[PDB]
Design an enzyme around this catalytic site. Structure first.
Site, mmCIF file in Angstrom:
data_model
loop_
_atom_site.group_PDB
_atom_site.id
_atom_site.type_symbol
_atom_site.label_atom_id
_atom_site.label_comp_id
_atom_site.label_asym_id
_atom_site.label_seq_id
_atom_site.Cartn_x
_atom_site.Cartn_y
_atom_site.Cartn_z
ATOM 1 N N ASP A 35 12.408 11.784 0.216
ATOM 2 C CA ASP A 35 11.102 11.212 0.523
ATOM 3 C C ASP A 35 9.931 11.829 -0.239
ATOM 4 O OD1 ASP A 35 8.986 9.964 1.879
ATOM 5 O OD2 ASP A 35 9.188 11.288 3.623
ATOM 6 N N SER A 198 -3.433 2.244 -9.788
ATOM 7 C CA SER A 198 -2.896 1.125 -10.554
ATOM 8 C C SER A 198 -4.071 0.383 -11.172
ATOM 9 C CB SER A 198 -2.087 0.184 -9.658
ATOM 10 O OG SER A 198 -1.717 -1.000 -10.346
HETATM 11 C C1 LIG Z 1 12.074 -1.508 8.558
HETATM 12 C C2 LIG Z 1 10.496 -1.483 8.509
HETATM 13 C C3 LIG Z 1 10.204 -2.033 9.958
HETATM 14 C C4 LIG Z 1 9.851 -2.353 7.382
HETATM 15 S S1 LIG Z 1 9.953 0.357 8.500
HETATM 16 O O1 LIG Z 1 8.471 0.380 8.227
HETATM 17 O O2 LIG Z 1 10.168 0.923 9.878
HETATM 18 N N1 LIG Z 1 10.824 2.149 8.440
HETATM 19 C C5 LIG Z 1 10.635 3.268 7.490
HETATM 20 C C6 LIG Z 1 11.879 3.387 6.540
HETATM 21 C C7 LIG Z 1 13.212 3.619 7.322
HETATM 22 C C8 LIG Z 1 14.386 2.906 6.911
HETATM 23 C C9 LIG Z 1 15.621 3.091 7.608
HETATM 24 C C10 LIG Z 1 15.653 3.982 8.694
HETATM 25 C C11 LIG Z 1 14.533 4.708 9.142
HETATM 26 C C12 LIG Z 1 13.296 4.530 8.451
HETATM 27 C C13 LIG Z 1 9.336 2.987 6.703
HETATM 28 O O3 LIG Z 1 9.329 2.849 5.479
HETATM 29 N N2 LIG Z 1 8.674 4.094 7.096
HETATM 30 C C14 LIG Z 1 7.355 4.441 6.586
HETATM 31 C C15 LIG Z 1 6.290 3.743 7.435
HETATM 32 C C16 LIG Z 1 4.889 3.986 6.978
HETATM 33 C C17 LIG Z 1 4.401 4.669 5.914
HETATM 34 N N3 LIG Z 1 3.031 4.606 5.986
HETATM 35 C C18 LIG Z 1 2.689 3.904 7.053
HETATM 36 N N4 LIG Z 1 3.794 3.516 7.669
HETATM 37 C C19 LIG Z 1 7.173 5.960 6.627
HETATM 38 O O4 LIG Z 1 6.802 6.513 7.669
HETATM 39 N N5 LIG Z 1 7.637 6.741 5.649
HETATM 40 C C20 LIG Z 1 7.757 8.207 5.753
HETATM 41 C C21 LIG Z 1 9.241 8.604 5.509
HETATM 42 C C22 LIG Z 1 10.260 7.957 6.510
HETATM 43 C C23 LIG Z 1 9.990 8.421 7.958
HETATM 44 C C24 LIG Z 1 11.018 7.785 8.925
HETATM 45 C C25 LIG Z 1 12.458 8.164 8.491
HETATM 46 C C26 LIG Z 1 12.690 7.763 7.018
HETATM 47 C C27 LIG Z 1 11.582 8.357 6.103
HETATM 48 C C28 LIG Z 1 6.860 8.922 4.672
HETATM 49 O O5 LIG Z 1 7.070 10.315 4.687
HETATM 50 O O6 LIG Z 1 7.225 8.467 3.366
HETATM 51 C C29 LIG Z 1 5.345 8.656 4.826
HETATM 52 F F1 LIG Z 1 4.785 8.926 3.674
HETATM 53 F F2 LIG Z 1 5.119 7.415 5.104
HETATM 54 C C30 LIG Z 1 4.725 9.556 5.906
HETATM 55 O O7 LIG Z 1 4.963 9.335 7.090
HETATM 56 N N6 LIG Z 1 4.324 10.776 5.515
HETATM 57 C C31 LIG Z 1 3.960 11.839 6.470
HETATM 58 C C32 LIG Z 1 3.177 12.934 5.750
HETATM 59 N N7 LIG Z 1 2.803 14.001 6.708
HETATM 60 C C33 LIG Z 1 1.464 13.693 7.304
HETATM 61 C C34 LIG Z 1 1.096 14.769 8.231
HETATM 62 O O8 LIG Z 1 1.047 16.051 7.508
HETATM 63 C C35 LIG Z 1 2.356 16.354 6.923
HETATM 64 C C36 LIG Z 1 2.731 15.297 5.982
#
Ligand SMILES: CC(C)(C)S(=O)(=O)N[C@@H](Cc1ccccc1)C(=O)N[C@@H](Cc1c[nH]c[nH+]1)C(=O)N[C@@H](CC1CCCCC1)C(O)(O)C(F)(F)C(=O)NCCN1CCOCC1
Length: 329
Positions: A35, A198
């Site tokens: 990630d 972009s």
């Molecule tokens: C299927 C969907 C309904 C279209 S989905 O949106 O739910 N699910 C995840 C991908 C996934 C696939 C299969 C199983 C489980 C999870 C989706 O892409 N998740 C995004 C949703 C999002 C992003 N922005 C707004 N909403 C996300 O949280 N991605 C984080 C990584 C994911 C977390 C769940 C497990 C899989 C990895 C992420 O890290 O990339 C991030 F950037 F979005 C984020 O959450 N970054 C957190 C950064 N923190 C902030 C606080 O200080 C410390 C650093």
């Protein structure tokens, strides 16, 4: 040194990609989600509440190289609301032949429901900037930050496949994996992400609109989240597309042939084929499909997720002044 590992989609929709990672001695292999939107390397472990484990776990007591990092704890929450927390160990971690010693391995004591429910992901491997690491009192470096001193070049590349295997390379740029040349663009680390701007976009065979779209390159996000006005311009070219309140975004007839979407990287153009934008049926057997390009309005930041990255060869240049490179493939 260099490393090369195969990354595979977890399902038929390319919801996420997993890569094998060897932790400890002897090696314990776990499938992690690489990630670029976070900076913690955390895994399901022998310490995780039993009722919340369904995944391959890391058992620090079976690793001769594991050391408890006294007094250190962590707690993280992601954009989708999922979370986890626990303690920290340092241990040997290897990816595709690239070994790092003394890497912080965050052991989960608890995980949220979404993690328990997804059997394919054993943990996360963060590749954003170390400033986002959640370990306290002292933050820990990412796997990439720890490997820089040993790498042949301070770079890692992402070559994600469309309903197919892909590759994550560390330390070298495989010149046979892309076509044309790589175009680099400036990265802002102000927020801890691989944030870039972009130069614009185009829908199908229409005109390219020069407009700055600040967003992040995030391998851990499935879809492509862009400004509401840009997203509307795209779906306007799909006759059956509409914004569905119940499903949570744009949906359209599965039978439709979607137009491509082009995004700018400096003077270069990256074309996402229409089929990549067809995420999949809302439910098996449904005639309605979910869109791969959705509005970032409720997120607060534009995200260049897998839908966009899988259409290109991406170079994450981790030199003192970082840059991001894109190439067609
Ligand atoms: C299927 C969907 C309904 C279209 S989905 O949106 O739910 N699910 C995840 C991908 C996934 C696939 C299969 C199983 C489980 C999870 C989706 O892409 N998740 C995004 C949703 C999002 C992003 N922005 C707004 N909403 C996300 O949280 N991605 C984080 C990584 C994911 C977390 C769940 C497990 C899989 C990895 C992420 O890290 O990339 C991030 F950037 F979005 C984020 O959450 N970054 C957190 C950064 N923190 C902030 C606080 O200080 C410390 C650093």
């Amino acid at each position: 040194s260099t490393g090369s590992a195969t990354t595979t989609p977890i399902d038929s929709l390319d919801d996420a990609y997993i890569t094998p990672v060897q932790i400890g001695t002897p090696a314990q292999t776990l499938n992690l989600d690489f990630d670029t939107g976070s900076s913690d390397l955390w895994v399901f472990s022998s310490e995780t509440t039993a009722s919340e484990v369904x995944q391959t776990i890391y058992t620090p007591s079976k690793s001769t190289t594991a050391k408890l990092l006294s007094g250190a704890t962590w707690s993280i929450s992601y954009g989708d609301g999922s979370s986890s927390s626990g303690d920290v160990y340092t241990d040997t971690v290897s990816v595709g032949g690239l070994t790092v010693t003394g890497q912080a391995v965050e052991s989960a004591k608890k995980v949220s429901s979404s993690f328990t429910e997804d059997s394919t992901i054993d943990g996360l491997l963060g590749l954003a900037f170390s400033t986002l690491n959640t370990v306290s009192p002292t933050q820990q470096k990412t796997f990439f930050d720890n490997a820089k001193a040993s790498l042949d070049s301070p770079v890692f590349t992402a070559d994600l496949g469309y309903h197919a295997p892909g590759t994550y390379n560390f330390g070298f740029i495989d010149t046979t994996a892309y076509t044309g040349s790589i175009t680099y663009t400036a990265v802002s680390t102000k927020q801890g992400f691989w944030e870039w701007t972009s130069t614009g976009y185009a829908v199908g065979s229409g005109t390219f609109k020069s407009t700055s779209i600040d967003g992040i390159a995030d391998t851990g996000t499935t879809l492509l989240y862009l400004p509401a006005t840009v997203v509307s311009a795209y779906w306007a070219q799909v006759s059956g597309a509409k914004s569905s309140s119940s499903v949570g975004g744009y949906v359209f007839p599965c039978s439709a042939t979607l137009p491509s979407f082009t995004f700018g990287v400096g003077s270069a153009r990256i074309v996402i084929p229409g089929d990549y934008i067809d995420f999949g049926p809302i439910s098996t057997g449904s005639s309605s499909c979910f869109g791969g390009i959705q509005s970032s309005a409720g997120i607060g930041i534009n995200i260049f997720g897998d839908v966009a990255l899988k259409a290109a060869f991406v170079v994450f240049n981790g030199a003192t002044t970082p840059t991001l490179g894109f190439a067609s493939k």
